Design an enzyme around this catalytic site. Structure first.
Site, mmCIF file in Angstrom:
data_model
loop_
_atom_site.group_PDB
_atom_site.id
_atom_site.type_symbol
_atom_site.label_atom_id
_atom_site.label_comp_id
_atom_site.label_asym_id
_atom_site.label_seq_id
_atom_site.Cartn_x
_atom_site.Cartn_y
_atom_site.Cartn_z
ATOM 1 N N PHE A 71 15.782 19.220 -1.482
ATOM 2 C CA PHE A 71 14.379 18.825 -1.625
ATOM 3 C C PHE A 71 14.161 17.370 -1.202
ATOM 4 O O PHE A 71 13.117 17.023 -0.657
ATOM 5 C CB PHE A 71 13.932 19.032 -3.078
ATOM 6 N N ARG A 96 -10.358 5.252 9.912
ATOM 7 C CA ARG A 96 -9.250 5.063 8.990
ATOM 8 C C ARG A 96 -8.139 4.288 9.673
ATOM 9 O O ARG A 96 -7.551 4.749 10.650
ATOM 10 C CB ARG A 96 -8.724 6.417 8.515
ATOM 11 N N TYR A 117 0.847 -1.185 0.000
ATOM 12 C CA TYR A 117 0.000 0.000 0.000
ATOM 13 C C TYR A 117 0.888 1.242 0.000
ATOM 14 O O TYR A 117 0.714 2.147 -0.821
ATOM 15 C CB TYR A 117 -0.907 0.036 1.236
ATOM 16 N N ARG A 129 2.485 8.434 13.245
ATOM 17 C CA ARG A 129 2.147 9.656 13.957
ATOM 18 C C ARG A 129 0.670 10.046 13.880
ATOM 19 O O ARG A 129 0.125 10.601 14.833
ATOM 20 C CB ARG A 129 3.011 10.812 13.435
#
Ligand SMILES: CO[C@H]1CN(c2ccc(C#C[C@@]3(O)CN4CCC3CC4)c(Cc3ccccc3)n2)C[C@H]1O
Ligand SMILES: CO[C@H]1CN(c2ccc(C#C[C@@]3(O)CN4CCC3CC4)c(Cc3ccccc3)n2)C[C@H]1O
Ligand SMILES: CO[C@H]1CN(c2ccc(C#C[C@@]3(O)CN4CCC3CC4)c(Cc3ccccc3)n2)C[C@H]1O
Ligand SMILES: CO[C@H]1CN(c2ccc(C#C[C@@]3(O)CN4CCC3CC4)c(Cc3ccccc3)n2)C[C@H]1O
Lengths: 341, 341, 341, 342
Positions: free
Chosen positions: C255, C195, C136, C183
């Site tokens: 980045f 969820r 997933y 978290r």
């Protein structure tokens, strides 16, 4: 400086509430806004004094702003109580004014003039249409929204983009003016002579005489018309949300948000409430303390407007001749709020 | 809207003083409390009517909370004055209740049932011991402290942690109740049949007949017994202080604090005062006005509690038999107040 | 000239962090990464929108990437918040999308489709095994690593051989998504509809039901479970180091590293901390300012990752149950780091 | 004729083997009311029990399940398996028959259904931690049925209107049944997916930190010691069961009311201090249940049987057992209430 000190003093005397809200602004902006308010307030005192001739008002109003550069000018026989003192001692205001930035003076001077001429317009005629209602609110409130928005940009506290389209700024002043007009119906119609602002275009489908709303006999039509008025003010909420979400400064935000949340609290309280026709409906001191406390940042403000918007919709049921009309207006308001959550 | 409105009018009619305090709350919180009050007042009305067979109450009271889920239930020949209309038109109350959130309904059902059973215990037995006194007060008052607390949390206005330990919420209920029981001694014992709330465990230490304290020939003992009741009452102040200091919402705080300060001011008046035995000692309209106005925030609420506590103290003699106990109970009270200053 | 502005305006609105990190990049790569983020963000909106039919999602998702060239398309009733404004105006996206190198274009489309088809697979089943998990995470985050990596190659800023094997690039993604998932437990569990993402396999061995961890009674095993969640996450660290050590362009490295170091810091925070089960645990403002400031080059980045990794371990004694699996895992990661220092 | 009523009885017999027999033996008048009443609650229970449905759905649908009783067209498409599912599908027959019942019967059924629906909602989104939660949960699913049945006896005229004055003992009737099943069904329940637990933490947390521990023989001493605590809690309602039974006046109402209670006592005496409870389903022999159905038709015989089962239960423990004192007391209290009506 003593002059500036008189301004704040007269301010607190003339409007307890706004005088607490204004304290959210930083000194410089605060000074300009305080003076801005006193200028318009003195203006409001002339238009409002129904003991003086219309020709006197149409003579003095159009050039009221010009007095801003005459530190000696002052008017003696107008208004009641403190307001009256404001005019008789207008000296302190104008001179406090002269010590302001040139960009501030201009916004103030300009708004004062446009409002003044708009007041003159509605002194010689009544509010018949919705278009009239919106324009009158534009002159007495909408323009203050414009004004403040221009002062925000001028102070540098907010971006120059803010003043690009002053539409949502006009909505800001309209939501507040309309909620007050709705809430003060009884008090206003009980004045001598009566004070009427509700647009005939709206009340004419519920009665032939607005004064009928004062009688319990016609309580069903009064409330039905009250509810259409609320529906008309809800139109502005989505725009109030947009405007508030565009503010970047904490001070400008708190000062701009608080009144709007107070207005949404009040509106949700006057909605479908027959008491509106015999008394002044107001939030509790506890609820206003909570509103002043939490309206310092976006998210919290949006949830309080959400909450009150939900309380408004919960005061009705399918049977009401507004249920459907109000319902979609509430969803629009809620969507816009969630549109920033 | 007629349902809730009936609630408020009956509320105002049956308890005008508390009706004012409840108006400190707003929106759904207030409705829930208004209904909560009416449910328990109806319960109390049935319980107090001595013309109703104890047997009926013993089975009807324990199921009183069940009428809440039956918008057709009402009672017809019970109650004094407006209390009758409440029972007769209870239908409005249950209907308003059916619209509260599930959380509010539950607190209200639960407390009502627990108070009902507690009353049942005391319908078949007198208040002899201090433990009985505290338990009886818990049944008719402490539990209301519990319920209100659960409602504050259930509303979201106060932290979910407030309900962890309801020990202090009970002290809140017991302080108000005991103050009333102390203050209404004369009025309570002077009716058919006599209502006795003062625990034998306390008064037996001063007489064989509590109904003798009326006589001005047993005042010295009556007064000493009174001071003992006041001392017992004072035990709860430190906890009331603690409870008040943990409230964050201003509405909830004013609502919760006003009755407490009123209670303390009343306690400082009945203390070591013979008049209690032949009349009803009340505060001045000014003190009342003062208390209702400033009890909107912790610091000011504490200053008033301290003041009334000190005036209670400065009314006794090193000569009086309670000087030692009271002084300690007084210092315990203040120590706790300063603890939050 | 106006379409990108919308993309950026919405990017900052939709994700404050990645909007800031996204600015480390140089324009060419930037515009692409931005449009790339939005495309996947819109995709995710439709996927999580628990309003639309599970029967309907499967039907479209595979189409989604095709809509990229349908510069007239738009969904106007999906999601909430700024997300909705994004989808209803997906037009600016698609058109801004047709101005990027055909190379960039394909990664977006290719990745989008693969991710889309991956969401469909899971829109019908549950995350039971640690394998279900990795897969997933691969669909939502992992593939993003591939994408961004394939974009770095196309740009010419990174060696063309950087995309030969994408195993590590997939590790970069799982590490972020997994740390987020750990978290956000409470935030995800307290949702309606609920969820869950934590693998049945991992928590089957700790509790009976997952929602059960909300209760303080179970911090004991809720934490033990949490630790096993962290322990799982730590498996990806060595490969995150390996990947960052291979980058040569200052912009791409910044980045690429900042999100990774942020994840590690959060991971070191949530580890062995029951606050994860009732509040969003997050790095302090000072800590993230330092992360953005220093993670511009390998060495400083390695030092920060090491530091956090060492705080991760310093939060457990030989007492704990995951101690052994952790001590080892912490080591593997530190060796990897030391291997490039 | 009334084909709708025949459907009710055929389905009743298909879904409940236990209660179908006692309901069927009832005097015709009130029997249909009881039959329809059972079906409605069993339907409600089916929905609430299907875990393949979102809590949010039930919390949104159960509270109004009683409104369909007045809608001859309402029926539920796909929930529950076996005969249970077939009931909800053709639930139109149940609602159809419901309409031909006396108004009083209809009111009792609706009110209890709704009160039960809402109670299931309560415990749908939370757990049974305290003994208070336990009694309360049993109240919503069983005690209330005791409430209703009693109400149905009055409305029927078979029992005195006085019967419904105080419904406390009625609630005791429901709890004794429900608690005995929950005790006996421990294993079956906990083996469910997801697992089912009703034993109150306030009682088991004292014998284990993980209820599943009892599943294995390594913790058999604590399991049993915990089982025995559960039985103790159940024994608390017996004195009240006795009082309720002794207050009935109609033979039909009495047999229908008594037989299930006697079966419960019999089952309780067999699960008590019996470790097999944690790995299989303990139950009376068919001959014992046949003997119980045959004799429990009048007060004396019922009391006598209740007595022997209670004495059989007490003889299964020893002085060394923890529960000794608690059980011995509750036993003596039960036996005493029985002796007072003999
Ligand atoms: C852009 O957000 C702002 C919108 N706000 C507004 C809008 C309109 C007004 C006003 C007004 C009055 O009609 C009331 N009173 C004082 C000025 C006029 C005439 C008599 C007022 C009151 C006012 C404030 C400050 C200076 C003048 C007037 N405030 C405050 C923020 O929420
Ligand atoms: C947490 O602090 C609170 C403590 N307060 C309390 C405590 C107890 C009561 C009460 C009461 C009664 O005994 C009086 N009357 C009405 C309810 C019972 C029975 C007959 C009442 C009166 C009451 C108020 C609102 C709802 C119900 C009852 N208030 C108000 C706050 O100071
Ligand atoms: C090569 O290392 C990289 C690893 N990075 C990742 C990895 C995964 C993601 C993601 C993601 C999402 O699952 C979250 N959200 C936005 C995109 C998807 C779907 C809903 C994101 C977010 C993202 C950033 C930029 C463009 C798209 C997505 N970044 C950034 C660098 O550290
Ligand atoms: C007055 O004493 C009575 C007490 N009795 C009871 C008490 C409770 C129940 C029940 C039940 C249920 O929990 C089982 N099932 C069907 C109804 C509920 C929900 C799922 C049942 C089963 C039942 C029988 C007949 C109609 C409805 C329910 N019976 C029968 C007599 O001993």
């Amino acid at each position: 400086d003593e002059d500036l000190r008189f301004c704040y003093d007269i301010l607190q005397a003339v409007s307890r509430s706004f005088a607490v809200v204004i304290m959210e602004l930083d000194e410089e902006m605060r000074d300009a806004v305080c003076i801005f308010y006193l200028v318009l307030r003195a203006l409001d005192t002339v238009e409002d004094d129904m003991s003086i001739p219309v020709e006197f008002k149409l003579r003095e109003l159009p050039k009221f702003h010009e007095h801003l550069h005459d530190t000696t000018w002052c008017m003696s026989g107008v208004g009641v109580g403190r307001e009256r003192e404001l005019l008789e001692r207008y000296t302190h205001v104008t001179r406090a004014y002269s010590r302001l930035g040139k960009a501030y003076q201009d916004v103030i001077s300009g708004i004062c003039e446009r409002m003044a001429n708009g007041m003159c317009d509605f002194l010689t005629r009544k509010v018949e249409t919705k278009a009239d209602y919106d324009l009158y609110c534009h002159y007495v409130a909408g323009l203050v929204g414009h004004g403040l928005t221009l002062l925000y940009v001028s102070s540098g506290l907010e971006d120059v983009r803010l003043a690009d389209d002053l539409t949502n700024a006009n909505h800001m002043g309209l939501f507040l003016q309309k909620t007050n007009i709705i809430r003060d119906f009884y008090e206003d119609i009980c004045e001598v002579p009566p004070r009427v602002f509700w647009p005939r275009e709206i009340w004419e489908k519920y009665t032939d005489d607005l004064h009928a709303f004062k009688d319990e006999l016609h309580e069903a039509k009064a409330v039905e018309c009250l509810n259409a008025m609320v529906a008309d003010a809800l139109v502005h909420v989505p725009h109030v949300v947009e405007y508030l979400a565009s503010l970047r400064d904490p001070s400008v935000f708190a000062f701009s948000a608080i009144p709007q949340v107070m207005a949404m609290a009040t509106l949700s309280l006057v909605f479908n409430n027959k008491d509106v026709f015999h008394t002044k409906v107001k939030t509790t001191r506890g609820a206003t303390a909570r509103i002043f406390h939490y309206s310092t940042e976006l998210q919290a403000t949006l949830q309080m407007l959400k909450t009150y918007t939900l309380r408004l919709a919960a005061r009705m049921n399918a049977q009401d001749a507004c249920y459907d009309r109000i319902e979609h207006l509430v969803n629009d308001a809620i969507r816009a709020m969630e549109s920033h959550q």
